[PDB]
mmCIF file of all heavy atoms in Angstrom:
data_model
loop_
_atom_site.group_PDB
_atom_site.id
_atom_site.type_symbol
_atom_site.label_atom_id
_atom_site.label_comp_id
_atom_site.label_asym_id
_atom_site.label_seq_id
_atom_site.Cartn_x
_atom_site.Cartn_y
_atom_site.Cartn_z
ATOM 1 N N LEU T 1 18.197 -5.806 -14.989
ATOM 2 C CA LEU T 1 18.555 -6.667 -13.852
ATOM 3 C C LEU T 1 17.422 -7.808 -13.451
ATOM 4 O O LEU T 1 17.683 -8.749 -12.946
ATOM 5 C CB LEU T 1 19.018 -5.855 -12.673
ATOM 6 C CG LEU T 1 20.463 -5.567 -12.940
ATOM 7 C CD1 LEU T 1 20.843 -4.309 -12.013
ATOM 8 C CD2 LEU T 1 21.410 -6.797 -12.642
ATOM 9 N N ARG T 2 16.149 -7.423 -13.947
ATOM 10 C CA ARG T 2 15.016 -8.227 -13.617
ATOM 11 C C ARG T 2 15.132 -9.597 -14.096
ATOM 12 O O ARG T 2 14.721 -10.626 -13.538
ATOM 13 C CB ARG T 2 13.793 -7.573 -14.296
ATOM 14 C CG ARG T 2 12.457 -8.408 -14.027
ATOM 15 C CD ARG T 2 11.306 -7.676 -14.543
ATOM 16 N NE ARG T 2 11.283 -7.630 -16.132
ATOM 17 C CZ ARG T 2 10.787 -8.651 -16.915
ATOM 18 N NH1 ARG T 2 10.253 -9.738 -16.335
ATOM 19 N NH2 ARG T 2 11.013 -8.647 -18.136
ATOM 20 N N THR T 3 15.681 -9.739 -15.310
ATOM 21 C CA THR T 3 15.967 -10.951 -16.011
ATOM 22 C C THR T 3 17.345 -11.584 -16.046
ATOM 23 O O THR T 3 17.634 -12.631 -16.655
ATOM 24 C CB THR T 3 15.352 -10.978 -17.319
ATOM 25 O OG1 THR T 3 16.116 -10.090 -18.259
ATOM 26 C CG2 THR T 3 13.949 -10.520 -17.546
ATOM 27 N N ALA T 4 18.296 -10.792 -15.360
ATOM 28 C CA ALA T 4 19.685 -11.207 -15.437
ATOM 29 C C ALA T 4 20.060 -12.343 -14.594
ATOM 30 O O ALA T 4 20.920 -13.190 -15.032
ATOM 31 C CB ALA T 4 20.541 -10.069 -15.135
ATOM 32 N N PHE T 5 19.551 -12.497 -13.329
ATOM 33 C CA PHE T 5 20.038 -13.680 -12.438
ATOM 34 C C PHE T 5 19.351 -15.036 -12.749
ATOM 35 O O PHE T 5 18.117 -15.017 -13.042
ATOM 36 C CB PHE T 5 19.833 -13.201 -11.054
ATOM 37 C CG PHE T 5 20.985 -12.461 -10.521
ATOM 38 C CD1 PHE T 5 20.656 -11.002 -10.576
ATOM 39 C CD2 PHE T 5 22.175 -12.848 -10.129
ATOM 40 C CE1 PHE T 5 21.764 -10.124 -10.251
ATOM 41 C CE2 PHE T 5 23.175 -11.963 -9.728
ATOM 42 C CZ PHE T 5 22.954 -10.570 -9.880
ATOM 43 N N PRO T 6 20.001 -16.155 -12.818
ATOM 44 C CA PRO T 6 19.433 -17.492 -13.054
ATOM 45 C C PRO T 6 18.365 -17.888 -12.191
ATOM 46 O O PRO T 6 18.425 -17.742 -10.872
ATOM 47 C CB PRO T 6 20.587 -18.304 -12.972
ATOM 48 C CG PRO T 6 21.677 -17.715 -12.159
ATOM 49 C CD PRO T 6 21.539 -16.261 -12.728
ATOM 50 N N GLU T 7 17.195 -18.390 -12.696
ATOM 51 C CA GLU T 7 16.123 -18.843 -11.984
ATOM 52 C C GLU T 7 15.432 -17.857 -10.826
ATOM 53 O O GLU T 7 14.983 -18.337 -9.791
ATOM 54 C CB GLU T 7 16.470 -20.156 -11.293
ATOM 55 C CG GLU T 7 15.543 -21.240 -11.924
ATOM 56 C CD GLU T 7 16.165 -22.264 -12.909
ATOM 57 O OE1 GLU T 7 17.040 -22.979 -12.516
ATOM 58 O OE2 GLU T 7 16.103 -21.860 -14.228
ATOM 59 N N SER T 8 15.496 -16.561 -11.204
ATOM 60 C CA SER T 8 14.963 -15.732 -10.272
ATOM 61 C C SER T 8 13.344 -15.762 -10.233
ATOM 62 O O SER T 8 12.711 -15.339 -9.331
ATOM 63 C CB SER T 8 15.381 -14.269 -10.658
ATOM 64 O OG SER T 8 14.716 -13.823 -11.757
ATOM 65 N N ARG T 9 12.856 -16.543 -11.163
ATOM 66 C CA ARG T 9 11.424 -16.745 -11.261
ATOM 67 C C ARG T 9 10.832 -17.858 -10.330
ATOM 68 O O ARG T 9 9.744 -17.710 -9.688
ATOM 69 C CB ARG T 9 10.874 -17.229 -12.731
ATOM 70 C CG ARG T 9 9.472 -17.790 -12.805
ATOM 71 C CD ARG T 9 8.964 -17.537 -14.160
ATOM 72 N NE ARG T 9 8.578 -18.792 -14.849
ATOM 73 C CZ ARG T 9 7.228 -19.140 -14.834
ATOM 74 N NH1 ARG T 9 6.303 -18.295 -14.431
ATOM 75 N NH2 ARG T 9 6.884 -20.331 -15.336
ATOM 76 N N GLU T 10 11.682 -18.864 -10.095
ATOM 77 C CA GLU T 10 11.232 -19.878 -9.080
ATOM 78 C C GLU T 10 11.485 -19.249 -7.661
ATOM 79 O O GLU T 10 10.692 -19.703 -6.709
ATOM 80 C CB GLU T 10 12.214 -21.058 -9.169
ATOM 81 C CG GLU T 10 12.023 -21.995 -10.412
ATOM 82 C CD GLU T 10 12.062 -21.354 -11.777
ATOM 83 O OE1 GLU T 10 12.767 -20.409 -12.094
ATOM 84 O OE2 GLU T 10 11.044 -21.793 -12.703
ATOM 85 N N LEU T 11 12.280 -18.292 -7.498
ATOM 86 C CA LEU T 11 12.466 -17.706 -6.225
ATOM 87 C C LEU T 11 11.247 -16.916 -5.914
ATOM 88 O O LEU T 11 10.612 -16.952 -4.960
ATOM 89 C CB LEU T 11 13.744 -16.817 -6.170
ATOM 90 C CG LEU T 11 13.753 -15.832 -5.057
ATOM 91 C CD1 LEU T 11 13.796 -16.544 -3.694
ATOM 92 C CD2 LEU T 11 14.947 -14.942 -5.174
ATOM 93 N N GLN T 12 10.962 -15.999 -6.903
ATOM 94 C CA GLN T 12 9.911 -15.156 -6.700
ATOM 95 C C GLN T 12 8.524 -15.942 -6.348
ATOM 96 O O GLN T 12 7.716 -15.638 -5.617
ATOM 97 C CB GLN T 12 9.633 -14.105 -7.867
ATOM 98 C CG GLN T 12 8.482 -13.301 -7.783
ATOM 99 C CD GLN T 12 8.796 -12.059 -8.598
ATOM 100 O OE1 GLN T 12 9.811 -11.589 -8.789
ATOM 101 N NE2 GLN T 12 7.625 -11.708 -9.255
ATOM 102 N N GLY T 13 8.250 -16.992 -7.118
ATOM 103 C CA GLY T 13 7.223 -17.836 -6.802
ATOM 104 C C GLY T 13 7.255 -18.432 -5.327
ATOM 105 O O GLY T 13 6.183 -18.367 -4.679
ATOM 106 N N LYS T 14 8.431 -18.812 -4.898
ATOM 107 C CA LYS T 14 8.470 -19.130 -3.500
ATOM 108 C C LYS T 14 8.234 -17.994 -2.544
ATOM 109 O O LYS T 14 7.576 -18.308 -1.509
ATOM 110 C CB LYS T 14 9.914 -19.747 -3.061
ATOM 111 C CG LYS T 14 10.339 -21.091 -3.887
ATOM 112 C CD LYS T 14 11.643 -21.616 -3.273
ATOM 113 C CE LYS T 14 12.095 -22.996 -3.850
ATOM 114 N NZ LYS T 14 12.779 -22.888 -5.196
ATOM 115 N N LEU T 15 8.588 -16.860 -2.789
ATOM 116 C CA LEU T 15 8.416 -15.680 -1.955
ATOM 117 C C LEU T 15 6.844 -15.286 -1.891
ATOM 118 O O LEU T 15 6.393 -15.208 -0.715
ATOM 119 C CB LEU T 15 9.297 -14.580 -2.448
ATOM 120 C CG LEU T 15 10.860 -14.521 -2.285
ATOM 121 C CD1 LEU T 15 11.647 -13.491 -3.072
ATOM 122 C CD2 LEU T 15 11.212 -14.538 -0.834
ATOM 123 N N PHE T 16 6.344 -15.425 -2.974
ATOM 124 C CA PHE T 16 4.854 -15.207 -3.113
ATOM 125 C C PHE T 16 4.126 -16.248 -2.292
ATOM 126 O O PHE T 16 3.285 -15.907 -1.381
ATOM 127 C CB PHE T 16 4.309 -15.259 -4.564
ATOM 128 C CG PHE T 16 2.794 -14.970 -4.577
ATOM 129 C CD1 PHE T 16 2.269 -13.929 -4.182
ATOM 130 C CD2 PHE T 16 2.125 -15.903 -5.413
ATOM 131 C CE1 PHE T 16 0.929 -13.436 -4.604
ATOM 132 C CE2 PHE T 16 0.716 -15.492 -5.751
ATOM 133 C CZ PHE T 16 0.195 -14.297 -5.263
ATOM 134 N N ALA T 17 4.456 -17.579 -2.442
ATOM 135 C CA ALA T 17 3.820 -18.534 -1.718
ATOM 136 C C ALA T 17 3.927 -18.360 -0.146
ATOM 137 O O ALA T 17 3.056 -18.867 0.555
ATOM 138 C CB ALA T 17 4.401 -19.919 -1.985
ATOM 139 N N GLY T 18 4.891 -17.730 0.283
ATOM 140 C CA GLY T 18 4.937 -17.383 1.711
ATOM 141 C C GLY T 18 4.290 -16.135 2.202
ATOM 142 O O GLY T 18 4.410 -15.779 3.369
ATOM 143 N N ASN T 19 3.626 -15.395 1.225
ATOM 144 C CA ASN T 19 3.080 -14.287 1.648
ATOM 145 C C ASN T 19 1.476 -14.352 1.452
ATOM 146 O O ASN T 19 1.039 -15.353 0.967
ATOM 147 C CB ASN T 19 3.387 -12.980 0.737
ATOM 148 C CG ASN T 19 4.906 -12.569 0.905
ATOM 149 O OD1 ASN T 19 5.600 -12.832 1.793
ATOM 150 N ND2 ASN T 19 5.462 -12.098 -0.364
ATOM 151 N N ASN T 20 0.784 -13.444 1.975
ATOM 152 C CA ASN T 20 -0.675 -13.504 1.774
ATOM 153 C C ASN T 20 -0.833 -12.962 0.322
ATOM 154 O O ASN T 20 -0.380 -11.810 0.063
ATOM 155 C CB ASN T 20 -1.394 -12.644 2.831
ATOM 156 C CG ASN T 20 -2.690 -12.389 2.391
ATOM 157 O OD1 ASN T 20 -3.210 -11.636 1.424
ATOM 158 N ND2 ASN T 20 -3.670 -13.113 3.217
ATOM 159 N N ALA T 21 -1.543 -13.813 -0.486
ATOM 160 C CA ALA T 21 -1.604 -13.395 -1.816
ATOM 161 C C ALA T 21 -2.151 -11.996 -2.170
ATOM 162 O O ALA T 21 -1.669 -11.347 -2.940
ATOM 163 C CB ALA T 21 -2.241 -14.454 -2.652
ATOM 164 N N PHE T 22 -3.320 -11.709 -1.502
ATOM 165 C CA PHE T 22 -4.088 -10.451 -1.696
ATOM 166 C C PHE T 22 -3.115 -9.208 -1.234
ATOM 167 O O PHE T 22 -3.086 -8.183 -1.951
ATOM 168 C CB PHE T 22 -5.372 -10.293 -0.905
ATOM 169 C CG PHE T 22 -6.483 -11.069 -1.487
ATOM 170 C CD1 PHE T 22 -7.269 -11.924 -0.678
ATOM 171 C CD2 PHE T 22 -6.904 -11.017 -2.890
ATOM 172 C CE1 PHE T 22 -8.485 -12.544 -1.165
ATOM 173 C CE2 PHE T 22 -8.105 -11.659 -3.371
ATOM 174 C CZ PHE T 22 -8.774 -12.516 -2.540
ATOM 175 N N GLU T 23 -2.394 -9.422 -0.284
ATOM 176 C CA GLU T 23 -1.539 -8.600 0.349
ATOM 177 C C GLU T 23 -0.364 -8.276 -0.653
ATOM 178 O O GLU T 23 -0.204 -7.147 -1.146
ATOM 179 C CB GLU T 23 -1.066 -9.132 1.648
ATOM 180 C CG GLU T 23 -0.195 -7.989 2.399
ATOM 181 C CD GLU T 23 -0.230 -8.312 3.874
ATOM 182 O OE1 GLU T 23 -0.504 -9.503 4.294
ATOM 183 O OE2 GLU T 23 -0.031 -7.392 4.784
ATOM 184 N N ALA T 24 0.315 -9.213 -1.179
ATOM 185 C CA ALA T 24 1.483 -9.076 -2.113
ATOM 186 C C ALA T 24 0.887 -8.459 -3.403
ATOM 187 O O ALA T 24 1.578 -7.556 -3.984
ATOM 188 C CB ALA T 24 2.136 -10.422 -2.457
ATOM 189 N N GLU T 25 -0.333 -8.798 -3.942
ATOM 190 C CA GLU T 25 -0.775 -8.137 -5.133
ATOM 191 C C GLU T 25 -0.989 -6.715 -5.126
ATOM 192 O O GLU T 25 -0.659 -5.876 -5.935
ATOM 193 C CB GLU T 25 -2.147 -8.899 -5.523
ATOM 194 C CG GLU T 25 -1.783 -10.282 -6.110
ATOM 195 C CD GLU T 25 -3.066 -11.242 -6.068
ATOM 196 O OE1 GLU T 25 -4.139 -10.856 -5.708
ATOM 197 O OE2 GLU T 25 -2.733 -12.482 -6.279
ATOM 198 N N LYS T 26 -1.539 -6.344 -3.882
ATOM 199 C CA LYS T 26 -1.711 -4.822 -3.641
ATOM 200 C C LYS T 26 -0.308 -4.253 -3.476
ATOM 201 O O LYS T 26 -0.208 -3.125 -4.040
ATOM 202 C CB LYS T 26 -2.605 -4.797 -2.170
ATOM 203 C CG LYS T 26 -2.693 -3.314 -1.746
ATOM 204 C CD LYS T 26 -3.660 -3.304 -0.644
ATOM 205 C CE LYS T 26 -3.221 -2.348 0.372
ATOM 206 N NZ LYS T 26 -2.200 -2.954 1.325
ATOM 207 N N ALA T 27 0.590 -4.813 -2.900
ATOM 208 C CA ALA T 27 2.021 -4.284 -2.778
ATOM 209 C C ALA T 27 2.551 -4.172 -4.182
ATOM 210 O O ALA T 27 3.196 -3.120 -4.535
ATOM 211 C CB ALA T 27 2.826 -5.229 -2.035
ATOM 212 N N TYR T 28 2.389 -5.204 -5.064
ATOM 213 C CA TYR T 28 2.916 -5.020 -6.493
ATOM 214 C C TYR T 28 2.206 -3.911 -7.251
ATOM 215 O O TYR T 28 2.955 -3.302 -7.923
ATOM 216 C CB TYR T 28 2.736 -6.447 -7.251
ATOM 217 C CG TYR T 28 3.371 -6.360 -8.593
ATOM 218 C CD1 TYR T 28 4.764 -6.187 -8.866
ATOM 219 C CD2 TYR T 28 2.568 -6.470 -9.861
ATOM 220 C CE1 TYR T 28 5.243 -6.088 -10.066
ATOM 221 C CE2 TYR T 28 3.048 -6.387 -11.047
ATOM 222 C CZ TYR T 28 4.395 -6.232 -11.189
ATOM 223 O OH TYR T 28 4.897 -6.252 -12.402
ATOM 224 N N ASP T 29 0.978 -3.764 -7.001
ATOM 225 C CA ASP T 29 0.459 -2.674 -7.729
ATOM 226 C C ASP T 29 1.023 -1.249 -7.399
ATOM 227 O O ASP T 29 1.278 -0.516 -8.173
ATOM 228 C CB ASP T 29 -1.061 -2.562 -7.824
ATOM 229 C CG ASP T 29 -1.780 -3.175 -9.226
ATOM 230 O OD1 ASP T 29 -1.555 -4.364 -9.467
ATOM 231 O OD2 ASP T 29 -2.082 -2.275 -10.028
ATOM 232 N N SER T 30 1.335 -1.144 -6.077
ATOM 233 C CA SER T 30 1.870 0.023 -5.552
ATOM 234 C C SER T 30 3.291 0.121 -6.047
ATOM 235 O O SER T 30 3.918 1.244 -6.187
ATOM 236 C CB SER T 30 1.740 0.055 -3.946
ATOM 237 O OG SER T 30 2.980 -0.391 -3.290
ATOM 238 N N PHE T 31 4.069 -1.022 -6.101
ATOM 239 C CA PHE T 31 5.448 -1.080 -6.675
ATOM 240 C C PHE T 31 5.424 -0.516 -8.089
ATOM 241 O O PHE T 31 6.358 0.317 -8.408
ATOM 242 C CB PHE T 31 5.989 -2.421 -6.671
ATOM 243 C CG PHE T 31 7.341 -2.602 -7.415
ATOM 244 C CD1 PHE T 31 8.535 -2.086 -6.678
ATOM 245 C CD2 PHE T 31 7.462 -3.216 -8.582
ATOM 246 C CE1 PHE T 31 9.681 -2.335 -7.353
ATOM 247 C CE2 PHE T 31 8.635 -3.398 -9.180
ATOM 248 C CZ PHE T 31 9.793 -2.992 -8.545
ATOM 249 N N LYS T 32 4.434 -0.870 -9.050
ATOM 250 C CA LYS T 32 4.328 -0.416 -10.264
ATOM 251 C C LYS T 32 4.148 1.105 -10.353
ATOM 252 O O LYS T 32 4.996 1.747 -11.074
ATOM 253 C CB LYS T 32 3.326 -1.046 -10.906
ATOM 254 C CG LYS T 32 3.357 -2.597 -11.258
ATOM 255 C CD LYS T 32 2.489 -3.104 -12.393
ATOM 256 C CE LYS T 32 1.141 -3.256 -12.050
ATOM 257 N NZ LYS T 32 0.366 -4.110 -12.913
ATOM 258 N N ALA T 33 3.409 1.638 -9.509
ATOM 259 C CA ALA T 33 3.144 3.028 -9.479
ATOM 260 C C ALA T 33 4.535 3.723 -9.094
ATOM 261 O O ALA T 33 4.798 4.795 -9.609
ATOM 262 C CB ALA T 33 1.888 3.509 -8.560
ATOM 263 N N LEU T 34 5.144 3.187 -8.184
ATOM 264 C CA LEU T 34 6.570 3.815 -7.801
ATOM 265 C C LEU T 34 7.516 3.768 -8.963
ATOM 266 O O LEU T 34 8.251 4.653 -9.277
ATOM 267 C CB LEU T 34 7.121 3.029 -6.587
ATOM 268 C CG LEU T 34 8.123 3.666 -5.601
ATOM 269 C CD1 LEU T 34 8.860 2.442 -4.988
ATOM 270 C CD2 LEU T 34 8.929 4.675 -6.224
ATOM 271 N N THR T 35 7.526 2.603 -9.810
ATOM 272 C CA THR T 35 8.443 2.597 -10.888
ATOM 273 C C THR T 35 8.127 3.716 -11.899
ATOM 274 O O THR T 35 9.080 4.260 -12.368
ATOM 275 C CB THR T 35 8.555 1.195 -11.564
ATOM 276 O OG1 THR T 35 7.309 0.876 -12.225
ATOM 277 C CG2 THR T 35 8.723 0.021 -10.567
ATOM 278 N N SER T 36 6.902 3.881 -12.068
ATOM 279 C CA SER T 36 6.594 5.028 -13.044
ATOM 280 C C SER T 36 6.909 6.330 -12.456
ATOM 281 O O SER T 36 7.325 7.232 -13.351
ATOM 282 C CB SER T 36 5.085 4.984 -13.309
ATOM 283 O OG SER T 36 4.476 3.828 -13.706
ATOM 284 N N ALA T 37 6.823 6.649 -11.296
ATOM 285 C CA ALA T 37 7.244 7.966 -10.745
ATOM 286 C C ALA T 37 8.605 8.016 -10.836
ATOM 287 O O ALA T 37 9.104 9.073 -11.381
ATOM 288 C CB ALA T 37 6.825 7.999 -9.160
ATOM 289 N N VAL T 38 9.368 6.957 -10.544
ATOM 290 C CA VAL T 38 10.793 7.002 -10.807
ATOM 291 C C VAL T 38 11.370 7.140 -12.209
ATOM 292 O O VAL T 38 12.323 7.984 -12.490
ATOM 293 C CB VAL T 38 11.434 5.807 -10.180
ATOM 294 C CG1 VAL T 38 12.936 5.718 -10.502
ATOM 295 C CG2 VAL T 38 11.214 5.699 -8.686
ATOM 296 N N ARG T 39 10.694 6.470 -13.196
ATOM 297 C CA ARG T 39 10.961 6.443 -14.436
ATOM 298 C C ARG T 39 10.669 8.031 -15.020
ATOM 299 O O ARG T 39 11.578 8.569 -15.565
ATOM 300 C CB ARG T 39 10.066 5.615 -15.308
ATOM 301 C CG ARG T 39 10.294 5.395 -16.816
ATOM 302 C CD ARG T 39 9.103 4.941 -17.605
ATOM 303 N NE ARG T 39 7.953 5.924 -17.249
ATOM 304 C CZ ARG T 39 6.753 5.529 -16.889
ATOM 305 N NH1 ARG T 39 6.496 4.135 -16.970
ATOM 306 N NH2 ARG T 39 5.828 6.249 -16.483
ATOM 307 N N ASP T 40 9.449 8.496 -14.751
ATOM 308 C CA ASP T 40 9.227 9.872 -15.000
ATOM 309 C C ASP T 40 10.401 10.842 -14.542
ATOM 310 O O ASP T 40 10.812 11.777 -15.253
ATOM 311 C CB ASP T 40 7.829 10.289 -14.506
ATOM 312 C CG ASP T 40 6.649 9.569 -15.173
ATOM 313 O OD1 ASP T 40 6.924 9.113 -16.344
ATOM 314 O OD2 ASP T 40 5.589 9.626 -14.732
ATOM 315 N N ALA T 41 10.819 10.662 -13.401
ATOM 316 C CA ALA T 41 11.973 11.543 -12.811
ATOM 317 C C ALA T 41 13.335 11.243 -13.317
ATOM 318 O O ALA T 41 14.217 11.930 -13.032
ATOM 319 C CB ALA T 41 11.826 11.682 -11.282
ATOM 320 N N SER T 42 13.482 10.083 -14.079
ATOM 321 C CA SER T 42 14.898 9.729 -14.303
ATOM 322 C C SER T 42 15.823 10.556 -15.080
ATOM 323 O O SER T 42 15.409 11.055 -16.233
ATOM 324 C CB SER T 42 14.839 8.298 -15.086
ATOM 325 O OG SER T 42 16.204 8.062 -15.379
ATOM 326 N N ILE T 43 16.999 10.758 -14.647
ATOM 327 C CA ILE T 43 18.097 11.495 -15.394
ATOM 328 C C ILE T 43 18.954 10.442 -16.239
ATOM 329 O O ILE T 43 19.925 10.750 -16.754
ATOM 330 C CB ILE T 43 19.018 12.282 -14.498
ATOM 331 C CG1 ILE T 43 19.684 11.360 -13.570
ATOM 332 C CG2 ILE T 43 18.297 13.370 -13.747
ATOM 333 C CD1 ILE T 43 20.820 11.980 -12.777
ATOM 334 N N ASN T 44 18.382 9.218 -16.262
ATOM 335 C CA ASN T 44 18.914 8.178 -17.120
ATOM 336 C C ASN T 44 20.545 7.895 -17.095
ATOM 337 O O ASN T 44 21.241 7.976 -18.223
ATOM 338 C CB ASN T 44 18.569 8.229 -18.578
ATOM 339 C CG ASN T 44 18.729 7.101 -19.392
ATOM 340 O OD1 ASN T 44 18.778 6.137 -18.937
ATOM 341 N ND2 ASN T 44 18.872 7.312 -20.662
ATOM 342 N N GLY T 45 21.140 8.076 -15.816
ATOM 343 C CA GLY T 45 22.540 7.804 -15.629
ATOM 344 C C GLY T 45 23.552 9.043 -16.009
ATOM 345 O O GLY T 45 24.730 8.871 -16.146
#
């Protein structure tokens, strides 16, 4: 779903521009760690 919707990249860039950059970067690194916890625990549908 990450790449399924059209031009979701220009949107993400606009959302970042409206956030504090250091703040969003720190949030994204914590998002990655969550995706790994979730992947590790996945029953895959």
Side-chain angles (χ1 to χ4, degrees):
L1 280 163
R2 178 175 72 85
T3 63
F5 284 89
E7 240 104 80
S8 71
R9 173 155 124 97
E10 286 52 43
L11 161 63
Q12 185 158 314
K14 298 187 173 75
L15 290 168
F16 181 56
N19 300 329
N20 169 283
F22 281 132
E23 194 157 20
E25 285 157 12
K26 174 170 146 276
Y28 181 62
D29 255 74
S30 94
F31 172 72
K32 295 202 282 195
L34 209 202
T35 66
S36 302
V38 175
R39 183 200 56 225
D40 289 342
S42 179
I43 60 170
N44 193 31

